[PDB]
Each structure stands twice: as C-alpha cells, then as structure tokens.
Amino acid sequence: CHPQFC
Amino acid sequence: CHPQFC
Amino acid sequence: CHPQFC
Amino acid sequence: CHPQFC
Amino acid sequence: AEAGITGTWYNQLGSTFIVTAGADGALTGTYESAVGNAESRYVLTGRYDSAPATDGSGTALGWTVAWKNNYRNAHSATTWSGQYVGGAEARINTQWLLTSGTTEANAWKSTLVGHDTFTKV
Amino acid sequence: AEAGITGTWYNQLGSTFIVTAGADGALTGTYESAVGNAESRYVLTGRYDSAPATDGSGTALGWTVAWKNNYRNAHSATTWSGQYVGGAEARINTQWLLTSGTTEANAWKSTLVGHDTFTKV
Amino acid sequence: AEAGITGTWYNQLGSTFIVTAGADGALTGTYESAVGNAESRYVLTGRYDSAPATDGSGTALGWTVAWKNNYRNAHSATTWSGQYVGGAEARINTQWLLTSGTTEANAWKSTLVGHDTFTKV
Amino acid sequence: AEAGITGTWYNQLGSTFIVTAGADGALTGTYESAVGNAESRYVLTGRYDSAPATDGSGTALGWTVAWKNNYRNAHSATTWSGQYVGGAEARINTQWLLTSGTTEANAWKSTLVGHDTFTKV
C-alpha cells in the first residue's frame, strides 16, 4: 500500500 | 517514420 | 530468489 | 552533442 | 491464457499483431505497423508463463520484433514485456524498449522507452 | 554479427546463456541463472537485425525468457533489448524489463527495470 | 508553459498534485496520494525547460517525491520525466521510476517503472 | 546519508555534480557535463529519504536537471532515480530518463533510458 498509490 | 509506428 | 539471479 | 554527455 | 492469447490484437495507434500461443510456452506470429500494407509486416517471436491462478492474476509474457523485412531495414529491434488479462474485455498491457545499432560514441542515445495496450476490438 | 553472436556469453553476476543466430534473423538457445545446475536452465527466443555497417555500429537484437521449467514456475518473464559489438572484446550491452503476473490492484508493482553486460570471457 | 503549468493536476487513479512554476525553471509543490487525507501529503521539487516554440512542441520537465512525512516513511523516492502540452485539453504525460533502499543482495529488485497522465479536470 | 551525500561526485564518462543534502530531505547543487567549462553548468534539485537502517540498506533519492542555462537551451530535462551506499567505497547507483519536448506526432521518440554510477574518486 505504497504512498504513491494509496 | 520508424516501422513500429508508420 | 528469482530464477534470473539465483 | 547533448549537454548531459558533452 | 494460451487459447485466450491466440488471435488478432490492435493497439491505440492502429498497429496489428497476429499471434499463436503454443502448448509449451511459445509465442510466434507477425506484427503489421499499418494494417493496410503487405509489408509493414515483420516476424515476431516470444514466450509466456502459463500457471494455475486462483486470484485473477495476469499471465506474464514478452516478444521481440527486429525491424527488417524485404522492403525496409531500420537497424533496430523492439521488446515488449507485460501481461495478458482475459475475460470480456481482454487486454495485453505492455512496456517496451526500442534499441538502434549505434557507434560507441552514440550508445547513450540508443534506447527509447514507452508503453502500449492491445485489445481484441 | 551472426557468427560473432553464436556461442556462450557470461554476465557480471555469473549467469550464462548459449545462443545460435540463424541466417534469417532468429536467435534460439538457453539461459542458466547459475552455471552449476541443470535446471536453472530456461528456453530463450529472440531476433537480431543484420545490416551492412561502414561506421562500426552495433547490431540491434532482443530476446525473452519465461521463468518456467520442470523445477520452478516463477509466474514472470524478462525481455532484454540491446546491441552486439564485436571484435577482440566483443560484448552485448542490454537493458531489461522483468514483469510478474499480478492482480489488477497490484499492476503498478508488476515491472522491474535494470541493465546487463555480457562478455565471452 | 509556466503560467499554464501552475495549478492543480489529477491522474487516472485519483492522486493530486499542486505545483508553482517559478520564473527561472523551478517547480515546487506537494503530491497527495489520496485527495482525502491531510497526510498522504509529501513535498515535491523539480525543473522545467522553458523555450520559444513555433511548431506546437511540448515543454520538457521532471520532479522527485521522497516518500517520507510525519505519518509515514516508506524508504523510497519516485522521479517523473515527461512533457507539458497546453490548450483546451492540457495534459502532462510522464514515465516514472520508483526506487526503494535495498541491501546489495537485493539491489536488482530496487526500481519499478510505469507511466502516468495528468489532466486539469 | 546526509553528510555522506554532501560533496562532489564523478561518473564514468567524466561529468561532475556538486550537491548539498539539507536536514529535511532537500538536495540542491549543480551538474557540469564537462568539468572544464564554466557553462556546461546547470542547476539541480531533488529529494532523499532519510531512515534508520539496521541491515545496510541504501538511501533512496532522486533529482532533475532541465538543460537550459545562459549558453544553451536543449529543450529537454533528465531525472535520475537510485540509491546512496556509503562507506569506504561510497557510490550512488542510478537509472535515468531523458525527455525532449516534441510535437504530438513525435511523442513516441521523446524519452531515452540509461543508467549511471557516481563515485567520490
């Protein structure tokens, strides 16, 4: 749930 | 006008 | 230990 | 002779 | 996979390829840059990784076209790497690398990168 | 090219591939991730673009390995795109794309990028 | 360019960034992964290449986000490289590289590649 | 990281950059393509992700150079994405994307990809 996406 | 595109 | 490397 | 290289 | 991959695929720009997925991992076929002319046609060859899926994963695959035929020799080759997703709107999503033969002085400008999506429609 | 490409190639990490370059653009062979064991071996297939060169250009080529054999199925495939440079220190310089089959939620993490150099020694 | 770049941009997945293009090539702003929460917010910094165009060329630009703020430290950074195209349907088209800090054993899995399109709407 | 990153770095081809890593994630400095001349010099800006490491991980970072100064405007920008590894042979290993402004017809040829290693020596 990488910060780039989520 | 490379063959990949044209 | 992906087969490309190992 | 792009500035990155030259 | 396999049977789902076999057939004709079209990208956004109007290129076409026709591919057969063989039983043991083989992909063979032809790529036409323009669907009009009978040689914008080039040979394609690649591999796909067949697997039991229980979670709706894509099927990983890749193929190469060298840009030489009886009408044209563009001194370059492209590889596409991506995955097949089946169903009512099946698609192949890819990223690609196109490399041209260069002198050693020019080798930093040899490889372009981009992406493509193919659909059956 | 062709005859110069046919043979055994080694990268920095100790993987090996053995390739035959056929007369009309074909590359076929096997990739061993570790040169010890008799199956870290996987089928390779690709294409190269033969051309008259008068300026010391490289020969553009590409190949695919799907990572499935009788001992392992890693649900992924790699493509290498680059060029052959011959002579007393012949090498193949490449960039590569490795894609894994994912669910659609995870498709942003599906493709790694890196680079490799192969030599005859 | 400049004035056309300044403002709020949205991609397909619903991330947002807000950027000011300064007079001498500077881009500064913030990226929110999810437009709800007040820290999915991360600092962005980059550069663009202003030029007289007489042929409808895009404006080349790039920026970096390191994925650390007061709520999260994901031990990674992304760069986006692409071009601004203005007009009634202005967009920024990009390719990106996301790198994670790894041990040296794992450095081959450190960099993912993908692409993004941003619009004003 | 930080203090280890601050200083002068050299790649294989003989380009140089000088960078200061600030306390809260900032990278600022200049890139000289050729270490002779006083303007092959261009502004650089980027970010790094500082973190407690207990396993010898690299530090993830990225930066952008737009290729415009008082002597040259090359209508392009490069981003480098990679990681810092410290110690007696500290290095920064990177992959890069160079994008040129194009017309929309030519947008498929806009982005080159390659890789660089920087050392202190």
Domain boundaries defined on chain H? 1-121
Q: F74 CB contacts (<8 Å, ≥6 apart)? A: C2, C3, E49, F67, F68, F100
Residue of F45, F101, F104 lying closest to E60 (CB–CB): F101
> Which residue of G lies nearest to E115 if distances are taken between CA atoms?
G115
Q: Do chains A and H touch (3 or more CB pairs under 8 A)?
A: no
Distance CA F2, CA F59 (A): 9
Contact G47, G22 (CB under 8 A): no
Closest CA to G16 of G25, G36, G6: G36
Tokens of H75: 């209508």
Amino acid type, H2 = E
C-alpha closest to that of G95 among F63, H84, H107: H107
User: Is D6's CB within 8 Å of H78's CB?
Assistant: no
Cβ separation of E111 and H112 shorter than 8 Å? Answer: yes
Chain G: list its partners (3+ Cβ pairs within 8 Å).
Answer: A, C, E, F, H
The answer to whether C and F touch (≥3 CB pairs < 8 Å) is: yes
Cβ-contact E75, E101 below 8 angstroms: yes
Q: Which residues pair with H93 in a beta bridge?
A: H83, H117
In chain H, the residue whose alpha carbon lies closest to the alpha carbon of G68 is: H49
Q: What whole-number distance in Å separates Cα of residue E114 and Cα of residue E82? A: 12
Q: How far, in Å, CA of H90 to CA of H33, rounded?
A: 21
Q: Which residues contact F100 (CB under 8 A, 6 or more apart)?
A: E60, F74, F75, F76, F110, F111
Report C:1-6 residues touching F (Cβ under 8 A).
Answer: 2-6
Tokens of F43: 């089928």
Residue G108: list chain C partners with CB under 8 A: 4-5
- Let me know if G37 is exposed, middle or buried by CB neighbors in 10 A (0-12, 13-18, 19+): exposed
Three-state SS at F111: strand
d(CA E73, CA E71): 7
- Residues contacting residue E98 through CB under 8 Å, at least 6 positions apart: B2, B4, E76, E77, E78, E111, E112, E113, E114, F81
Alpha-carbon Rg of chain E, whole angstroms?
15
- Give the dihedral of Cα atoms G119, H61, H51, H19; nearest 10 deg: -130
Token readout for D6 is: 């030259």
Closest among F62, F45, F41, F38 to F116, alpha carbons compared: F62
Q: Give yes or no for a contact between E66 and E77, defined as CB atoms under 8 angstroms apart.
A: yes
What is the C-alpha to C-alpha distance for residues A5 and G112, in angstroms, rounded to an integer? 13
Q: What is the DSSP letter of F51?
A: -
Q: For F99, what's the count of Cα atoms within 13 Å in the CB-facing half-sphere?
A: 32
Q: Angle F103-G94-H45 (CA atoms, 0-180°, nearest 5)?
A: 120
Whether G109 contacts chain C with CB within 8 A:
yes
Chain F nearest CA to G118, separation (Å): 16
Q: Smallest Cα–Cα separation from E57: which of F99, G113, F72, F104?
A: F104
User: Which residue in this structure is represented by tokens 């680059």?
Assistant: F82
E93 DSSP β-pair partners: E83, E117
Q: Is H71 annotated as a binding residue?
A: no
Q: Report chain H's C-alpha Rg in angstroms.
A: 15
Q: Do G109 and C4 touch (CB under 8 A)?
A: no
H110-113 long-range Cβ contacts below 8 angstroms, 24+ apart: H110/G58, H110/G83, H111/E112, H111/E113, H111/E114, H111/G81, H111/G82, H111/G95, H112/E108, H112/E109, H112/E111, H112/E112, H112/E113, H113/E97, H113/E111, H113/E112, H113/E113, H113/F95, H113/F113
Q: Is F4 helix (H, G, I), strand (E, B) or coil?
A: helix
Which chains does chain E touch, 3 or more C-beta pairs < 8 A? Answer: B, D, F, G, H
Instruction: Answer yes or no: are the C-beta atoms of H87 and H65 closer than 8 Å.
Output: no
What's the token pair of residue H112? 């080159």
Whether there are 3 or more C-beta pairs closer than 8 Å between G and A is yes
**Going by C-beta distance under 8 Å and a sequence separation of 6 or more, which residues neighbour residue H24?**
none
> Angle CA(H43)–CA(H107)–CA(G55) in degrees, nearest 5?
80
Chain F partners within 8 Å of A5 (Cβ): 108
Coil, strand or helix at F87 = coil
Give residues 48 to 67 of E whose Cβ lies within 8 Å of F: 48-51, 53, 55-67
| C5: exposed, middle or buried (Cβ count in 10 Å: 0-12, 13-18, 19+) | middle
Hunting for tokens 């490397």 — which residue is that? C5
Ramachandran angles phi, psi of F43, nearest 5°: -65, 135
> F104: distance to nearest CA of chain H, Å?
25
| Residues of chain H positioned with their CB less than 8 A from the CB of E109 | 112
Distance from CA of A6 to the nearest CA of F (A): 11
- Is residue F20 a contact partner of residue F27, using CB atoms and an 8 Å limit? yes
E45 class by beta-carbon count within 10 Å (0-12 exposed, 13-18 middle, 19+ buried):
buried
Pairing of strands G59-68, G41-48: antiparallel
Nearest CA in chain E to F74: E49
CA F77, E63, E113 angle in degrees (round to 5)? Answer: 90
- Residue by residue, DSSP assigns G45-108 as EEEE-----SS---EEEEEEEEEE-SS-EEEEEEEEEEEEE-STT-EEEEEEEEEE---STTGG
Q: Do H40 and D3 touch (CB under 8 A)?
A: yes
Contact between C4 and F72 using a beta-carbon 8 Å cutoff: no
User: Phi then psi for G4, rounded to 5 degrees?
Assistant: -60, -30
Q: Show the tokens assigned to E37.
A: 């002319």
CATH of E1-121, one of 3.30.420.40, 3.30.450.40, 2.40.128.30, 1.10.10.10: 2.40.128.30
Contacts of G104 (CB under 8 A, 6+ apart): H56, H58, H85
Q: Is E104 on the interface with D (CB under 8 A)?
A: no
Is the Cβ–Cβ distance between G56 and H102 less than 8 Å? Answer: no
- Residue C6: closest CA among chain G residues belongs to which residue? G105
Of H46, H51, H93, the CB nearest to G45: H46
Nearest-angstrom CA–CA distance, G16 and H53: 31
G4: DSSP letter: G
H111 touching E, CB under 8 A?
yes
Q: What is the per-residue DSSP string for chain E?
A: -GGGTSEEEEETTS-EEEEEE-TTSEEEEEEESSSS-TTSEEEEEEEE-----SS---EEEEEEEEEE-SS-EEEEEEEEEEEEE-STT-EEEEEEEEEE---STTGGGSEEEEEEEEE--
Interface of F with E in 25-44 (CB under 8 A): 25-26, 43-44
Distance from the E10 Cα atom to the nearest Cα atom in chain D, whole angstroms: 36
What does residue F2 show for φ and ψ, rounded to 5 degrees? 30, -85
Structure determined via: X-ray
